[model samples]
Target: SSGLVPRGSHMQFVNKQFNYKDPVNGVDIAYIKIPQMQPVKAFKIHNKIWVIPERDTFTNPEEGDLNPPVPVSYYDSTYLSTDNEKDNYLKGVTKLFERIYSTDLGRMLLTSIVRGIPFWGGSTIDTELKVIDTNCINVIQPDGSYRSEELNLVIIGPSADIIQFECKSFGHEVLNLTRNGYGSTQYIRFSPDFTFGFEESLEVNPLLGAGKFATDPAVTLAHELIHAGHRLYGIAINPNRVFKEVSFEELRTFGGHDAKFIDSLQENEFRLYYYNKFKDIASTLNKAKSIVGTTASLQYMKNVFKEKYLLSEDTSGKFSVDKLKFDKLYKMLTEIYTEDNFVKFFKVLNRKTYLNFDKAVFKINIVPKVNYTIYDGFNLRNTNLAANFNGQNTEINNMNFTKLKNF
Candidate 1:
């Protein structure tokens, strides 16, 4: 007990003896009801926030070195010293404080000028619920019986169990075997090395620009909340179900886990959407005088050949803006719908960006699909992972995906 490091609350030991009656494996997990501080104060729903009364999770990261075992601190950025064990980085502390308190507190402190309400009047929805951490220790000398050592685990009883988010560490492989979201289902899971200071982690920490912590947390929570909310309301559309209605062979044949998952997921999402939009556009074109109003057909009603993207590099370097060669695009659209006039007018409206729309499409859906432009003006389009969230949605400069077994 003397050597027990203080974590959250006053230390207490639980019975290590195995009890048959105790269900769920004697994990007396309690939802230590963190009463509503206000109407809308929010925190991580299932990723319970353990409000350590004495130990500040925000400011105590570097305090690792002050312990008996001598904590190890490794720095990837140049801000911290390379001396692996040194935790006395004053810059780290300042950055930590600024990251945790600066923008988030300001957002809470400042009231709305237009709404004329206290900033937190309707903002306080959930308080930082504290959970007592316990260890599982093995006592060796008690009647020659052993009491297991304790381990810190946060147990804040059930909240909205949203999607699981994963973090990828420096040297880990990520794989996404399956995905299906239901009511309050897990969203993501990342590399374990994504503990605290990784620049991409959405966890509340200084390294992640935690000064924008509230927004960061809110965006993540709200996103999952929306997903959960949809599932709760039965609006959550499962990709698996959607994929079932489509040709399985076309959707299931991607190579990489990230590619395969996103490809199938986003393909389902957009296929239905595009199919519906196609019908609407068809109706509008039928009632209209020209195909100008048929935006859906006008947009994607053309053949996107691989050679079309290679506008710059050609053996002869002859510049040609031949729009008639793109006639195959509208012909394909005509195959979708049997109307002849609509197909003819659709080809007239086809242009360059419509062909390059695949990049934008994937970006909006948060998925990544391979795109290429050939030297002779060819555009290669792969729309499989249009809305994939498996770490493909972000730019490497800013950095941050979907759930994966190894990913």
Candidate 2:
């Protein structure tokens, strides 16, 4: 069964550390060590493990003959080249990514793999390795996802071990956003990075407006990152909002990913991308922090997206309702509704219980109320002699009226 390496021997897996920095500013961020899909082999005997690097396979490599250099992508060379004309949008977003990472809200969107949210998130994949007949071992990942060379792995000599590895990773998925050209483009032809997905195929974000909104590439990246977060980090953020392909009916409803995730993401991106403007504008009047009435802090937030979406109105207004679900008014209000609701959500996440009490009591006087009782003034004859006029109402009325007149 074994073609190259000896039978009963298996390749090793290893993880090494890689540090990431702000590409635009050189700000040092954290580093992570993940299992790298490198050309390493290992075999086990008794309780011992042995690791073999590609170097061990060659002799005197660095000095002359077998000089081996790591793969281009392995050293981060195969990154999506921002060195092109169309890359400005991508470049701007990369800076935003760094800035977002600096904030509290951006923690979920920008963090490589959110803490406590496993890199693999949840894959139904059982812990198992792809069984290959030859020395070329391809670790089986969920959804046919592949291993990333950016990270590292540790594999000591072949153990007769049933390598229980779950390799479908979120970090890898998020990185795909960073490094790829569309399914077919000159950028891809020139790019050293790789594959085809929704992002690659995307040209213009038709969901947005033409100039201020539709044209900005950051919003495009913003939308998709929330997507990865949903299917991968589903309940970790919003329990009710797990996403998958939808019905033709539901697709008709929103025209995109779950409405809750996107509507919220775009507005939050307003917060993430425009915080400086948000802060300056919010503080300019400073009457907001000075709020006893309608606050301006939130209005400042709304204006950015309102400008971005450019929902033209006030002239030929009406029948206008509704992007990829980019509701002009919806996004405007959500900037307030959600950012606060966002805080409310976290409070709940932090164990605060929020019970919504809503009701409507429709009382109708379509049937009017009883005005006066029979024994009371409405009973004209018995009014003066009410209690005593039990026997005859006519006699009592006549007698009581005559007596009162004489008196």
Candidate 3:
């Protein structure tokens, strides 16, 4: 692998930065960098430490547990029981990636990245360079407790001693960055700047409606990945969410403003081509909802997946009468399909668009919480943000700290 960058290496992840004209306050926010795959058990498969996933490893010292004495340890491997770790993590990461990669979401995130590091966000980086290893699954401190998040800079063989000599290596100084105001969620100064959510109007959001719930996907991720199909591309199309933005002032001043907008818009729109290429996720979930109520899509959910899948009854009766493995199932499905979910979802969406099959790909996501929290909850712009989020596309929604440390 001499001199070969895996992929997504030069990627500039993002967060929101807010400037308040009235309050005379400004802050930058880069959402926390959420990992795309589940945190895994790091096993030495070959000389390499392989990162295999485990929600709650019963394997004990043999593998590694998730919580407590373990810094990031979780009690349950299955997505059910009193709490849900994998479910929440996967859902959140998926939702964040979806919106961030969606048209406006992708545009805004890349703009922030570009604004901070000029010319880096828009460049085409290979996805193959990005490896979904399970190292973090069992990441622990030197004491073997839960691991504190830090950037890992490892040099192999010949690259070991060449640090500052040839590569211009240097140490980074940590700065105590803070949010400026009460209603301020933008903290771009922090290493993982744009992670927090405050009540405000987000110019770019993924929700179908608008308002209060806009960009709600970042609040918590495990719940978000479920609705990733609606992220509007970038993941499969531009999984890196590489897009650009230009101010409205410049657009109006320049005659070619339309061209600029279209350029960015269409580049981001490539993801939709897949929806057109395969079956529709929106309509399919919608139709399934009618048939099975809330649990209609459970049939499509994965069976006997990792993280100890289980079957339990929905006391709410909103989904189905059968005891299905809802939590672990959803989490596992989201994890396994992290990359392929869009592929499969769109494959169906693809056929639908070609033959005009509308049922498979519905117009929007199924998280009903957005309707009350976003649309009716807020104004149009904000509601639009809410409908698109509602705990679905994890990538765009969640703050990713892992990326802050060395790769």
Candidate 4:
């Protein structure tokens, strides 16, 4: 007989334990353990590969650090180094700051991101609610004061924690995952190994230059910040918080606690958002045609964004502000990411940077049919122990932590 179900999601852990290592000190920080049946499957969402290990949850990420971790810090067509750490090129750690704070958007977003930290640590998201008088997109309250949906979803809760930053140490694996991530947020490390964003032309002309802002490590920072934010929210808001992040949730029919747990977890975390934008755009387009006679299409709008992002391998290449006035790039970015378009961009980040979380079709093994009510347990010492978190206790009992073992 075949085990089949209507493909729903569940979050439970495996009764497996291992020592969690400190990324900085390379020592055991916590004794790690998982649910009786955590997940294990691989899929590409957005641009990253995701899998469920002991993690049906918890995401402190890193950025590109492949092979030898080294640096090639760029400034006006010259690669240079700033300091040496552990006698092995500590990456021009300043370059990371340069990329982020150099522009208005970059500086502003950085400022906003930092402010959330104080809020996360102790204060409530201390602020006032006000209504927008003009040019408001995706408003939750018409003619009333309301919070920004995008802000609530991505920015606010994540603001509570003080996400630490570090440059990848020489011969060190980030979060002990062999530098598997680029800019991980669990202590939010920035790796010098790869161009954090894109390795493209860097141009700054007091005389108005050309080409897009490639090699954007700030975008890389943006990625990890989001990851860190979720950690806090998962901790503070969810009573299960940090502890039971690896426990059970309701899984639908034929619930094999294999891979779908994590697959479903991420999808629900970044839910799909829709708006009246198509109507707004069509109306705006019609109005523009009536006034200026003609302007752009949806494709042209997409292309406009596309042109702003093509990175050149020619490191020395530079041109006219791509032609015509470009102001504080960081300034523009601050506005850019804060705009309604940013929601669209945020959706893009959802894909691997931010990706689709659908296709988690799975097959179950050894089921009477339904495998529900499974959860995580505390870790006692043992590797390859022929046991699981299922029957450990009442909290320490043989309830239903195992999918194979039914109630």
Per-candidate clashes, comma-separated: 63, 24, 97, 48
Candidate 4 weakest ten by summed lDDT: 43-52
Which tens-of-lDDT digit does each residue in 1-407 have in candidate 3? 11111134421232211111112111121111212333322221111111111232222234243232211111222222222332222222323333334333343433321221100011123211111111112244333354322111111111111010111111113211110000001111000011212222235636633222122222112112212211211122222333254322222112122324435465335424432322222222223322221232433431111111122224442222122333223223223323223323221111111111111110122122332121121111353323433322223332221111111
Ranking by TM-score: 4, 2, 3, 1
TM-score pick, better of 3 and 4: 4
Q: Write candidate 2's Cα lDDT for 153-241 as tens digits.
A: 11211111111111112223332211110000000011101111111111354763311100111222232333333222111122233
Worst 10 residues of 2 by lDDT: 181-190
Candidate 4, number of clashes = 48
> Mind giving the per-residue lDDT tens digits that candidate 1 earns over 223-268?
2222222222112233454343332221221111212443546545
Which parts of model 4 have CA positions greater than 4 angstroms off? Answer: 1-91, 118-186, 195-218, 229-407
Off by over 4 Å in 2: 1-90, 116-215, 234-407
Tens-digit lDDT track of model 4 for 1-407: 11112122421111111212212111111112111322212111111111111211222224211111112221111111121221111111222233334445445544433322111111122221121111111222222333321111111001111122221111122121111111111233433222211111223545633211111223445444333322211211121322242322111100223214436564334221101211222233222211111244433432322232221112322212221122232123222333222223322111121111221111111111122111101112342211332122112222222212100
Assess each prediction's global lDDT (C-alpha) against the native. Answer: 0.21, 0.22, 0.22, 0.22
